[PDB]
Design a protein around this nucleic acid. Structure first.
Ligand SMILES: [Mg+2]
Ligand SMILES: [Mg+2]
Ligand SMILES: [Mg+2]
Ligand SMILES: [Mg+2]
Ligand SMILES: [Mg+2]
Ligand SMILES: [Mg+2]
Ligand SMILES: [Mg+2]
Ligand SMILES: [Mg+2]
Ligand SMILES: [Mg+2]
Ligand SMILES: [Mg+2]
Ligand SMILES: [Mg+2]
Ligand SMILES: [Mg+2]
Ligand SMILES: [Mg+2]
Ligand SMILES: [Mg+2]
Ligand SMILES: [Mg+2]
Ligand SMILES: [Mg+2]
Ligand SMILES: [Mg+2]
Ligand SMILES: [Mg+2]
Ligand SMILES: [Mg+2]
Ligand SMILES: [Zn+2]
Lengths: 125, 98, 80, 24, 155, 206, 127, 60
RNA sequence: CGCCGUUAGUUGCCAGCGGUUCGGCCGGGCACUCUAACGGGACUGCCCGCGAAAGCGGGAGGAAGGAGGGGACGACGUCUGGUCAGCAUGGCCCUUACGGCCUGGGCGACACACGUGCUACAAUGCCCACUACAAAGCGAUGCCACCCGGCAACGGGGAGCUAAUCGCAAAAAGGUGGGCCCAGUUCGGAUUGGGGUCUGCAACCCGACCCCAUGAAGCCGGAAUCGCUAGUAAUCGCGGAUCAGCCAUGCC
């Protein structure tokens, strides 16, 4: 059943399945199960309607998940850029932000490589 | 109950205490617990053999500190008089807390 | 995920120089070298000319940039 | 792995403590 | 080994069957020096063979290893142009080393999730004469005596 | 690169340290830095007396300071003028009452520190290297010594290309700890540049 | 009445005490199968006893200190062998041939510089 | 190093943070041991002249 | 480093015992372990085969055998090798600066490329819990026990230590039980958002750490290429030097 915004994890432990929800991770999961007394090991397909409702009414009225969360984050970074912020300019360039060395290994933040002229008449190492 | 600690960078110089202090009364006055060795804290200084590069060279230097306990119950009048100020070692330090 | 504890820091060079302009009016350019100072509410409106190691760049302070440091709005290195 | 901060071995390696590794 | 002839290092006999060959197999299974986890796997396999076969486990192991030993193999060698796979006997020392190694290798190719199950079913398949471990042996033998046109290069 | 200081290599045996005195982890660096201030000063003043090794000891806030020279005469001073002011400047650095002593060197031709200091003075004084060295080794070898060796660095003769001049006699088993080999080094500030001078003297075995 | 033997191995030391008894082994307070619980090697330590058809002829109180259970397993096997020769000197004609008496001297080789792990040398490229 | 820079014990360095070791024998500010006040080069030099009490060459 | 002995027992222990808050915690002996000073022990010494001899194969006694294992040690010299930015040092050049002083910036730039490494791609694994074993080292204007508050980083409190006598410490791989069930996954933890601790005059450029959220590439790597012969490789974790703190996944 749908716990969080359009969420349908089934055939798995509740505390694991819950993770598939956006803003929900291992912590929030095993936490929402304790504050609603739902045996974490139980499979979603084996949950009481009564239990699901509790989970639904809780997890949604306790945290800010899914799309609405993407919205805030998408919004936050956009804010960093609108103002002349530094981290902002970094987000514009697509370069690391948490002060990482960009002479090498900035791949994850730069996507596939953009190999161009790297040498011509000197040690090509 | 005489407790005297013995530090030092040389282990033969410290011995210039046991074979000198236990000569008062080992089987007459006090019992003299004798000089206990105790572990010896070692300090290593590892250094690159030469200036500039050559990280894989290095030479090792240690500054071994030796210890001694002694401890002698029965702070005898005459026994202390002798074992009072008749020493010789220069590379030894003493601590007293009997 | 920033952090400074409990005791927001700002260099009194301007901290005491700004609170003054709040006793008269605005002011054009306030060249400083203190990019350490966490911009405080009582600055919005003022135009602090932060230094970049080479020049003083004017940064109009807005409600939006409260807890941000003056340096963050004054880029240092020059890329393409 | 030793790279997971919020895990047991993650803290050991990084030589730290927290919810994922109390002191006792 | 340019100087010494190299001497085989005998190993401590088995702590069950007492067989030294058994220990050897366990060493191959062992990785990162986790001997306990290793043995805990081999013996776990002997249990899996006792229910699958009415015959004792050691009888199976012996058989398996034996089936997997190659009688002949080819060893590259330049003779005056390109490289030439020259067939030649395999010393008893090597037959053993290879059997055990291959056994453990094919073993970890099987789909079964539990390690012990992989070694067990693999040993059984070996004594039966089937199983990918016995294939390698067959393919290696098929390799030589398929180059008999060079066997006169003993080496 | 090769070849470790032959003393640093024997410090343990057949070569007692040059300053015996314990010192906790907190004071040591100080008591040590002081040794230098001292060893340095004396080394510059007592130059003409020609010193070998300034040994130093320490006690209940005390300081040995036993300078080993060949011309104690010049050390002491006339009736005690040299040996005077020295303890006046020494005790200033060390407010621990620094006694001071002077020892005689039983022949300065078995004192590598000197033999080297010798050849060095010759070179700074435009002498012919090969000869000074051949003589030095001789003198050393002349009075006992089961072996000896002298080495001068480069620019031998003011030349543009630096070189190294050998010269040695008897034995000098550097690879044996049980050797008791004295070692001495001396610069040689000249008009064209420096020139190292190392001196080795092999005396006694076990 | 009671026989002793030292026994050491690769940084492990264990005192062994044998007394004509049943067979229980009070290792560091716990039963044998309790201290070396689930380690296919333990049975080794007790091996020397089987060298002379003893085992149930003795009892053994053992205290270990230093190293790892496996290193200790061997140290223990050395005590159970010595304390046995003290019980009977003639218990060497058998207890020895199997080697049970030799003291395994292999030790963690020092860690040299310019090398990662003592011998394991760092790797390079152009060469 | 340069003489101008030699002055670690300059005292009152404004903030304890700006204070830095520096060799007492050569001015080297790059690998000065606390126990000796010296840099790794000098530590090697003097130790060879047994001028560092008790400091011997280790070996195990 | 490997075995034994002697000398010394505020480490040690039911050894045999008596007191147990049944913790070697008090008594108390130092036997054993250990600590460390010193000392013994192997020398082809003995037996057998071969040998002209040196010595080679093999055997016994022995902790150890024939260089028992690991170090320190590196010849005459070569590379006109490295370093005048450690330090000296000849020559040359600079003066109102090629000196000095600061605040700030830079050495942390990035379309690219390589070396060395870390962490992985998972089930002989990952997670959680309980529980057993080290060594070598560290403790001031420091190491910080059992206490309280906080999920926590850590904050307040405060004992002992001055350190074989207190602390750092929890060793980790391991073992026992449970979970996961082959999935880009309870594999991996990159990146990014948010909140916060601490060190520091100060963390924007440029710190480490904690918690929530996010959860990338990666399914074992082309040509080619590296280390290692035994307590070695591989694998696991611990300490230290530098050091306020830390970019150490480095070094020892
Ligand atoms: Mg080399
Ligand atoms: Mg070397
Ligand atoms: Mg002012
Ligand atoms: Mg994980
Ligand atoms: Mg001139
Ligand atoms: Mg190791
Ligand atoms: Mg200078
Ligand atoms: Mg600093
Ligand atoms: Mg003994
Ligand atoms: Mg009792
Ligand atoms: Mg002979
Ligand atoms: Mg040699
Ligand atoms: Mg750099
Ligand atoms: Mg709490
Ligand atoms: Mg399990
Ligand atoms: Mg692989
Ligand atoms: Mg690895
Ligand atoms: Mg540090
Ligand atoms: Mg570390
Ligand atoms: Zn220096």
């Amino acid at each position: 059943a749908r716990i969080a915004g359009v969420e349908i994890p089934r055939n798995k432990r509740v505390d694991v399945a819950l993770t598939y929800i956006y803003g929900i991770g291992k912590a929030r999961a095993k936490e929402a199960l304790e504050k609603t007394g739902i045996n974490p090991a139980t499979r979603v397909k084996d949950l009481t309607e009564a239990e699901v409702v509790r989970l639904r009414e809780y997890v949604e009225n306790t945290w800010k998940l899914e799309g609405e969360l993407r919205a805030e984050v998408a919004a936050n970074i956009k804010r960093l850029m609108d103002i002349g912020c530094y981290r902002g300019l970094r987000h514009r360039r697509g370069l690391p932000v948490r002060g990482q060395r960009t002479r090498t290994n900035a791949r994850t933040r730069k996507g596939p490589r953009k190999t161009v002229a790297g040498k011509k008449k000197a040690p090509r190492k | 109950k005489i407790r005297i600690k013995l530090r030092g960078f040389d282990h033969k110089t410290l011995d210039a205490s046991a074979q000198k202090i236990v000569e008062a009364a080992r089987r007459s006055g006090a019992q003299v617990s004798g000089p206990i060795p105790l572990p010896t804290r070692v300090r290593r200084f590892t250094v690159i053999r030469g200036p500039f590069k050559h990280k894989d060279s290095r030479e090792h230097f240690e500054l071994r500190t030796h210890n001694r306990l002694v401890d002698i119950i029965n702070p005898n009048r005459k026994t202390i008089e002798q074992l009072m100020t008749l020493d010789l070692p220069t590379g030894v330090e003493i601590e007293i807390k009997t | 995920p920033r952090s400074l504890k409990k005791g927001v820091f700002v260099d009194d060079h301007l901290l005491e120089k700004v609170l003054e302009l709040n006793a008269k009016g605005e002011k054009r350019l306030i060249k400083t070298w203190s990019r350490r100072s966490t911009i405080v509410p009582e600055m919005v409106g003022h135009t602090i000319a932060v230094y970049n190691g080479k020049q003083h760049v004017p940064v109009y302070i807005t409600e939006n940039m409260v807890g941000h440091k003056l340096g963050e709005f004054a880029p240092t290195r020059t890329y393409r | 792995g030793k790279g997971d901060r919020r895990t047991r071995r993650g803290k050991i390696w990084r030589g730290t403590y927290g919810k994922y590794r109390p002191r006792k | 080994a340019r100087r010494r002839r190299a001497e085989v290092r005998q190993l401590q006999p088995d702590l069950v069957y007492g067989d030294v060959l058994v220990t050897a197999f366990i060493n191959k299974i062992m990785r990162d020096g986790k001997k306990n986890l290793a043995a805990r796997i081999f013996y776990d396999a002997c249990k899996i063979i006792q229910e699958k076969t009415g015959q004792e486990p050691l009888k199976v192991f012996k058989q398996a290893v034996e089936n997997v030993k190659p009688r002949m193999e080819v060893r590259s060698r330049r003779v005056g142009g390109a490289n030439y796979q020259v067939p030649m006997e395999v010393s008893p020392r090597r037959q053993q080393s290879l059997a055990l190694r291959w056994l453990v290798q094919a073993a970890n190719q099987r789909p079964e999730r539990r390690a012990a199950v992989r070694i067990a079913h693999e040993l059984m398949d070996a004594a039966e004469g089937k199983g990918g471990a016995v294939k390698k042996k067959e393919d290696v033998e098929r390799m030589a005596e398929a180059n008999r046109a060079y066997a006169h290069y003993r080496w | 690169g090769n070849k470790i200081h032959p003393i640093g290599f024997r410090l343990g045996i057949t070569r007692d340290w040059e300053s015996r005195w314990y010192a906790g982890k907190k004071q040591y660096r100080h008591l040590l830095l002081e040794d230098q201030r001292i060893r340095g000063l004396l080394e510059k003043e007592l130059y003409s007396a020609g010193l070998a090794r300034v040994d130093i000891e320490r006690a209940a806030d005390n300081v040995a300071v036993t300078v080993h020279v060949a011309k104690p005469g010049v050390v002491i001073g006339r009736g005690g003028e040299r040996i005077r002011v020295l303890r006046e400047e020494l005790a200033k650095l060390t407010g621990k009452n620094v006694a001071l002593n002077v020892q005689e060197v039983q022949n300065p031709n078995l004192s590598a520190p000197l033999v080297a200091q010798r050849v060095a003075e010759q070179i700074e004084r435009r002498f012919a290297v090969r000869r000074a060295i051949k003589q030095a080794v001789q003198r050393v070898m002349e009075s006992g010594a089961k072996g000896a060796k002298v080495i001068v660095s480069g620019r031998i003769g003011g030349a543009e290309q630096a070189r190294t001049e050998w010269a040695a006699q008897g034995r000098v088993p550097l690879h044996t700890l049980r050797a008791n080999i004295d070692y001495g080094f001396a610069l040689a500030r000249t008009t064209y540049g420096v020139l190292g001078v190392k001196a080795y003297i092999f005396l006694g075995e076990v | 009445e009671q026989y002793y033997g030292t026994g050491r191995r690769k940084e492990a030391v264990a005192r062994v005490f044998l007394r004509p008894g049943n067979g229980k082994v009070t290792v560091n307070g716990q039963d044998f199968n309790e201290y070396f619980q689930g380690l296919v090697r333990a049975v080794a330590a007790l091996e020397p006893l089987r060298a002379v058809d003893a085992l149930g002829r003795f009892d053994a109180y053992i205290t270990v200190r230093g190293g790892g259970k496996s290193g200790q397993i061997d140290a223990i096997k050395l005590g159970i062998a010595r304390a046995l020769v003290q019980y009977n000197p003639d218990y060497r004609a058998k207890l020895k041939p199997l080697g049970f008496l030799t003291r395994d001297a292999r030790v963690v080789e020092r860690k040299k510089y310019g090398k990662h792990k003592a011998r394991r040398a760092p790797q390079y490229s152009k060469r | 190093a340069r003489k101008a820079l030699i002055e670690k014990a300059k005292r009152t360095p404004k903030f304890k943070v700006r204070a830095y070791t520096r060799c007492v024998r050569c001015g080297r500010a790059r690998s000065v041991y606390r126990f000796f006040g010296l840099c790794r080069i000098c530590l090697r030099e003097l130790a060879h002249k047994g001028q560092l009490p008790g400091v011997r060459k280790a070996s195990w």
